[PDB]
Amino acid sequence: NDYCQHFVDTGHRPQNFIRDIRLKDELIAKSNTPPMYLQADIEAFDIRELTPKFDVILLEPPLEEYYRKCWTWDDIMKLEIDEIAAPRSFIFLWCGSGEGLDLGRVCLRKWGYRRCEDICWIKTNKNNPLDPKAVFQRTKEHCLMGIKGTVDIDLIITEEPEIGNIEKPVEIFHIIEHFCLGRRRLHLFGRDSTIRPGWLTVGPTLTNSNYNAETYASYFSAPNSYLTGCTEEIERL
Amino acid sequence: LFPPQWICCDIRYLDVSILGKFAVVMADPPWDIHPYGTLTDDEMRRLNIPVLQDDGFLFLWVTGRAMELGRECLNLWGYERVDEIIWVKTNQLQRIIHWLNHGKEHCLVGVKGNPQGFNQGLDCDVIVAEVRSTSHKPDEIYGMIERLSPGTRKIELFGRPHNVQPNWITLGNQLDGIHLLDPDVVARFKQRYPDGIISK
Ligand SMILES: Nc1ncnc2c1ncn2[C@@H]1O[C@H](CN(CCNc2ncnc3c2ncn3[C@@H]2O[C@H](CO)[C@@H](O)[C@H]2O)CC[C@H](N)C(=O)O)[C@@H](O)[C@H]1O
């Protein structure tokens, strides 16, 4: 059965027809720092104030293409991500499906990472059967994984969200957390709706803030400076 | 011609200028990713892709670090990457098969020049199709390529015998001999290769 032909015939995307650990999530949840968040206009904001250096950065700038303030790849590329990333650390960069697939890789290289996974968010249209340069209908987005220093699959499948909904699948958080990469986790351009235990969310649309660098850093003082996020908390007194 | 045509060769040494111009180029190169016969990064860069097209599309399979290197070659060869096809690899029951398990392979889409009269936007950028033998890419890509550019000349690089299709010329070192029917090509091949085959 040719699902490409079927989509030409009927409009049902080929991905519509793809068919179809607990203890770990529990250790992740016990290990999680309280959610912390900070309203900041990131164009105007000195990210160096975000300390300590992060083990994981999730970067979700609002691209023009999500809306059919927007950030161009010009703005993104000028972010000083490398000044807040721990010497060994990871980045997850949402790149969309256009030129971001190329310009996001330049970014990763500019900030000192190499790509090790290309995670694809494939969008079904079961409930509802173009860029000028596009050759094809674009039905997916890419989240690039980068590493600097020395169970899950690289696909997320969900239904296409309603128009004007720019939220990315919460599954990206489970994939990141299941890598057990460290507990300093930063979400740049997160939102009220994305705040989440074990994460520091920084974005311009947050309506409240509770971030305090000293308080935040106290979650990772000894004996907890090197925990992976997937181990039992270290016993005290 | 129109039926399948092919040329067993080493694509490094074939004077591909004898083949003329194609509306679409597809390639599945044996990138030297860190087992069974590869091309070095420099050999890949030096491939004489630029003579194959004036205006049209390149389809370039990539995996691993070829995702970045293939973008280099793609740009060096004179293309702009305008799309990226994802083949979701399934079994016969439509279930998906370092840090993450890989459920897919990638096919970069480059444009060169200004193509006109292609039916852009008929297919979507996701393929869902059954894994066959190792490295055997899905046949759906030929239907997508045919709807996009019906009846035009097309050329596949690093094809195996099962890759040969109508309107395509397949080059690869595991093809059986030389099978050419387009008289223009037959004439240019006999001029350049009177005694049959050469190197460097
Ligand atoms: N100098 C030369 N001149 C002319 N021909 C040459 C020259 N050298 C070599 N050849 C011939 O090219 C052909 C190349 N085939 C190999 C193409 N690449 C790849 N190899 C290996 N794994 C690949 C891969 N792609 C994707 N994966 C996936 O990745 C994982 C492991 O990496 C796995 O999960 C894989 O699944 C082309 C296949 C052809 N499209 C089909 O559809 O069968 C083959 O015949 C060679 O002799």
Which resolution in angstroms does this entry have? 2.3
Contact in structure between B146 and A4 (CB atoms under 8 Å): no
Q: Do the annotations mark residue B7 as ligand-binding?
A: no
Contact in structure between B154 and B23 (CB atoms under 8 Å): yes
Residues counted in chain B: 200
The closest alpha carbon to B137, from B166, B109, B104, belongs to B104
Alpha carbon distance A181, A72 (integer Å): 29
Q: Is the CB of B35 under 6 A from ligand 1?
A: no
The token pair at A6 is: 């079927």
Q: Judge whether A179 lies within some domain.
A: yes
C-alpha angle B67-B131-B61 in degrees, rounded to nearest 5: 20
Residues counted in chain A: 237
User: Ligand 1: distance of its center to the CA of B50 in Å?
Assistant: 21
Distance from CA of residue B12 to its chain's centroid? 14
How many domains does chain A divide into? 1
Alpha carbon distance B75, B71 (integer Å): 6
Contact in structure between A66 and A191 (CB atoms under 8 Å): no
Alpha carbon distance A135, B112 (integer Å): 12
**Residue nearest atom 26 in ligand 1 by C-alpha distance:** B135
| Domain range for A162 | 3-218
Is A160 strand, coil or helix?
coil
Alpha carbon distance B144, A136 (integer Å): 9
Q: Helix/strand/coil (H, E, C) string of chain B?
A: CCCCEEEECCCCCCCHHHHCCCCEEEECCCECCCCCCCECHHHHHHCCHHHHCCCEEEEEEECCCHHHHHHHHHHHCCCEEEEEEEEEEECCCCCECCCCECCEEEEEEEEECCCCCCCCCCCECEEEEECCCCCCCCCHHHHHHHHHCCCCCEEEECCCHHHCCCCEEEEECCCCCEECCCHHHHHHHHHHCCCCCCCC
User: Ligand 1: distance of its center to the CA of B64 in Å?
Assistant: 13
Breaks in chain A at C–N > 2.5 Å: after which residues? 20, 68, 129, 150
Q: Judge whether A126 lies within some domain.
A: yes
> To probe the interface with A, which of B33, B57, B105, B125 has the most A CB atoms within 10 Å?
B125
Is A74 strand, coil or helix?
helix
CB nearest B121 (choices: A14, A19, A137): A137
Measured over the CA atoms of residue B108, residue B113, residue B118 and residue B122, the dihedral's sign is positive
Alpha carbon distance A184, A144 (integer Å): 19
Q: Which residues pair with A140 in a beta bridge?
A: A122
Q: Judge whether A196 lies within some domain.
A: yes
Q: Where are the alpha helices (DSSP H) in A123-189?
A: 171-178
Which chain B residues are Cβ-neighbours of A154 within 8 angstroms?
100-104
CATH code (residue A183): 3.40.50
Measured over the CA atoms of residue A213, residue A31, residue A170 and residue A88, the dihedral's sign is positive
Amino acid identity of residue B33, one-letter, is: I
The token pair at A230 is: 């997937």
Pairing of strands B5-8, B178-179: antiparallel
Alpha carbon distance A4, A2 (integer Å): 5
User: Ligand 1: distance of its center to the CA of A33 in Å?
Assistant: 47
Q: Is the CB of B156 under 6 A from ligand 1?
A: no
How many domains does chain B divide into? 1
Q: Judge whether A231 lies within some domain.
A: no
Determination technique for this entry: X-ray
Q: In Å, how far is A222's CA from the nearest CA of chain B?
A: 28
Which helix (H) or strand (E) is A132 found in, with range?
Answer: none
Using most ligand atoms within 8 A of CB, pick from B158, B160, B164, B198 the residue to mutate for ligand 1. Answer: B158
Q: Judge whether A224 lies within some domain.
A: no
Q: Judge whether A232 lies within some domain.
A: no
Q: Which residue has the tokens 């950028």?
A: B125
The token pair at A175 is: 């994939």
Contact B123 A120 (CB under 8 A): no
Q: Which residue has the tokens 């894994």?
A: B131
| Domain range for B145 | 1-196
Pairing of strands B56-62, B104-112: antiparallel
Q: Judge whether A89 lies within some domain.
A: yes
Contact A116 B98 (CB under 8 A): yes
At CB < 8 A and 24+ separation, what contacts does A66-70 make?
A66/A96, A66/A166, A67/A164, A67/A166, A68/A163, A69/A43, A69/A204
